[PDB]
Amino acid sequence: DDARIAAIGDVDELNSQIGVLLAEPLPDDVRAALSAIQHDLFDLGGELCIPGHAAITDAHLARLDGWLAHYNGQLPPLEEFILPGGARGAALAHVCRTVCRRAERSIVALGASEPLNAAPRRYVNRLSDLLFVLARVLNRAAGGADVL
Amino acid sequence: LSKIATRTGDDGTTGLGDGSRVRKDDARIAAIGDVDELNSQIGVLLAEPLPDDVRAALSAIQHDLFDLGGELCIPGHAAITDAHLARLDGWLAHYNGQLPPLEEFILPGGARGAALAHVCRTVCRRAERSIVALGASEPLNAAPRRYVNRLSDLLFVLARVLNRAAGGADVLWD
Amino acid sequence: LSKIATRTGDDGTTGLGDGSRVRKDDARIAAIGDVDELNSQIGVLLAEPLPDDVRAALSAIQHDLFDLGGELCIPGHAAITDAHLARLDGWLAHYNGQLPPLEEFILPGGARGAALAHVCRTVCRRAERSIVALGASEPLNAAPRRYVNRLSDLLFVLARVLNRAAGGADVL
Numbered sequence: 001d002d003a004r005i006a007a008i009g010d011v012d013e014l015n016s017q018i019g020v021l022l023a024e025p026l027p028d029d030v031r032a033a034l035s036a037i038q039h040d041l042f043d044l045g046g047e048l049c050i051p052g053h054a055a056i057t058d059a060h061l062a063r064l065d066g067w068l069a070h071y072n073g074q075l076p077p078l079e080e081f082i083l084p085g086g087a088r089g090a091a092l093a094h095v096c097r098t099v100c101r102r103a104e105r106s107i108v109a110l111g112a113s114e115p116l117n118a119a120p121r122r123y124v125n126r127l128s129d130l131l132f133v134l135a136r137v138l139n140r141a142a143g144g145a146d147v148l
Numbered sequence: 149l150s151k152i153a154t155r156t157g158d159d160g161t162t163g164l165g166d167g168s169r170v171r172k173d174d175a176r177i178a179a180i181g182d183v184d185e186l187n188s189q190i191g192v193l194l195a196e197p198l199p200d201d202v203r204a205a206l207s208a209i210q211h212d213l214f215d216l217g218g219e220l221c222i223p224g225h226a227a228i229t230d231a232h233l234a235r236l237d238g239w240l241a242h243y244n245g246q247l248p249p250l251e252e253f254i255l256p257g258g259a260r261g262a263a264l265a266h267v268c269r270t271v272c273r274r275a276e277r278s279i280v281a282l283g284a285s286e287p288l289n290a291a292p293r294r295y296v297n298r299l300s301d302l303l304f305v306l307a308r309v310l311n312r313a314a315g316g317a318d319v320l321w322d
Numbered sequence: 323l324s325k326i327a328t329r330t331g332d333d334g335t336t337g338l339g340d341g342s343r344v345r346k347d348d349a350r351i352a353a354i355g356d357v358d359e360l361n362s363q364i365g366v367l368l369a370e371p372l373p374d375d376v377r378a379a380l381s382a383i384q385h386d387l388f389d390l391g392g393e394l395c396i397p398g399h400a401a402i403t404d405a406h407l408a409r410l411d412g413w414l415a416h417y418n419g420q421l422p423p424l425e426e427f428i429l430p431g432g433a434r435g436a437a438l439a440h441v442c443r444t445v446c447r448r449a450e451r452s453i454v455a456l457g458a459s460e461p462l463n464a465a466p467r468r469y470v471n472r473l474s475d476l477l478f479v480l481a482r483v484l485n486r487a488a489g490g491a492d493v494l
């Protein structure tokens with residue numbers, strides 16, 4: 001039906017939102033991670049599209065896990081629920097976060113109607129969490145703080 | 149086969165505030181998501197220069213949206229009340245009263261802030277559709293629906309307010 | 323009983339231009355919404371500095387999209403014609419002949435304007451899916467789908483044009 005084409009489109013939309021975030025000033029490390037993720041998302045979309053073709057591996061998941069641990073250990077503990085916003089960069093990261101979750105919903109729907117490896121949903125599951133973390137990093141880097 | 153440790157929702161499911169689990173493509177999770185996406189777009193608008201009063205209203209709205217999402221997360225919970233709807237209706241009367249009557253149809257755009265407000269407006273209307281869809285398959289309070297109904301209207305109004313504030317005007321349709 | 327007055331759309335239903343009403347999650351309302359969201363994203367791109375011709379094309383497109391939303395609101399009515407499709411084809415030829423042959427795959431991004439154009443492109447394809455879905459349940463003129471299909475291609479080309487105009491470059 002529409003499941004595959006919809007999932008591909010949402011991943012594309014997410015990747016485009018990340019492109020907008022990349023047009024902003026960013027810490028060099030954050031920029032490097034986001035740029036690499038764009039390539040990952042391009043490959044992810046290809047896996048969703050072509051039958052019998054896989055591209056996302058444990059290595060991709062491991063790298064995301066590594067970035068999560070890294071950036072989180074670079075931030076103070078969460079003291080309260082956060083509202084999406086702050087420096088423009090942080091706000092955009094939150095938009096990316098929500099679009100990534102939207103793509104995850106579509107990927108989950110796709111896997112329910114067609115055989116699909118688990119890597120794609122596990123990738124965006126981690127990515128959503130990382131974008132949340134990166135938003136906090138960007139507020140920090142802007143000399144500001146998260147919106148509570 | 150995978151050597152990577154499993155994370156909470158790696159299996160495509162997630163939990164609700166009452167302890168129940170649902171698949172991530174569930175209508176309720178979709179509505180929660182659209183509300184979150186709307187709140188995030190408002191965060192982008194808040195990152196722009198804005199009149200103090202407009203910033204105050206939008207900031208308060210983010211809190212409302214956080215609670216609305218929380219209500220969608222905890223089935224049977226009620227965080228959105230008449231007070232919330234009354235405040236939106238008040239802001240609507242407040243800003244509309246200071247603007248000239250809407251003449252021709254307008255196109256979404258203008259000053260960057262007004263343009264962003266229009267994006268917020270459309271994402272808000274998208275959230276309204278998913279909230280309406282959730283309510284058609286699950287008993288839900290009407291407040292959430294009524295709240296976003298008013299919010300898209302207010303976002304439209306605030307877009308006009310922002311074009312004026314920038315010293316410009318609304319983009320008119322041919 | 324709520325102490326707040328009710329709006330006509332508070333019950334979750336809304337009206338169509340033909341006097342009928344449907345629930346807001348109806349396929350037709352979803353398509354109207356996505357076209358509106360796309361037009362709004364184009365509004366954000368129009369707030370960026372742009373080459374004069376690109377601004378003229380995008381501004382005209384906003385009027386087309388408003389018309390398209392109007393056609394979707396009035397079931398059966400026809401507002402978008404081949405004339406609109408032809409203009410898009412014209413712009414596609416014009417801007418493509420303004421760019422070097424694309425050799426490698428492109429990632430969405432670059433100068434802010436180009437990045438926004440790609441966001442517009444993805445939202446446009448989302449509206450196309452909604453319009454296509456509407457056709458699965460109701461008879462629908464072909465112009466609306468043909469228009470957004472062409473527009474998604476045009477937005478891709480305009481993104482490339484904007485990267486060059488901003489002294490930037492496409493992300494390979």
Ligand SMILES: Nc1ncnc2c1ncn2[C@@H]1O[C@H](COP(=O)(O)OP(=O)(O)OP(=O)(O)O)[C@@H](O)[C@H]1O
Binds near residue numbers: 128162178
């Ligand atoms: N893809 C999604 N779209 C919208 N809302 C979501 C999505 N995934 C989770 N949520 C909601 O957000 C809350 C927490 O998000 P989180 O991503 O931590 O959940 P999870 O994916 O189940 O856990 P984990 O990240 O540890 O795998 C949950 O209460 C859930 O209702």
Ligand SMILES: Nc1ncnc2c1ncn2[C@@H]1O[C@H](COP(=O)(O)OP(=O)(O)OP(=O)(O)O)[C@@H](O)[C@H]1O
Binds near residue numbers: 297329330332338
């Ligand atoms: N959530 C939505 N998404 C997309 N289109 C909508 C939505 N709600 C209404 N529309 C369409 O847009 C037009 C005007 O929107 P409006 O919000 O004024 O309608 P309503 O919600 O029925 O009325 P009210 O706002 O007074 O309750 C209507 O003709 C309707 O077809």
Ligand SMILES: [Mg+2]
Binds near residue numbers: 125126128129157
């Ligand atoms: Mg998760």
Ligand SMILES: [Mg+2]
Binds near residue numbers: 297298300301
């Ligand atoms: Mg309404």
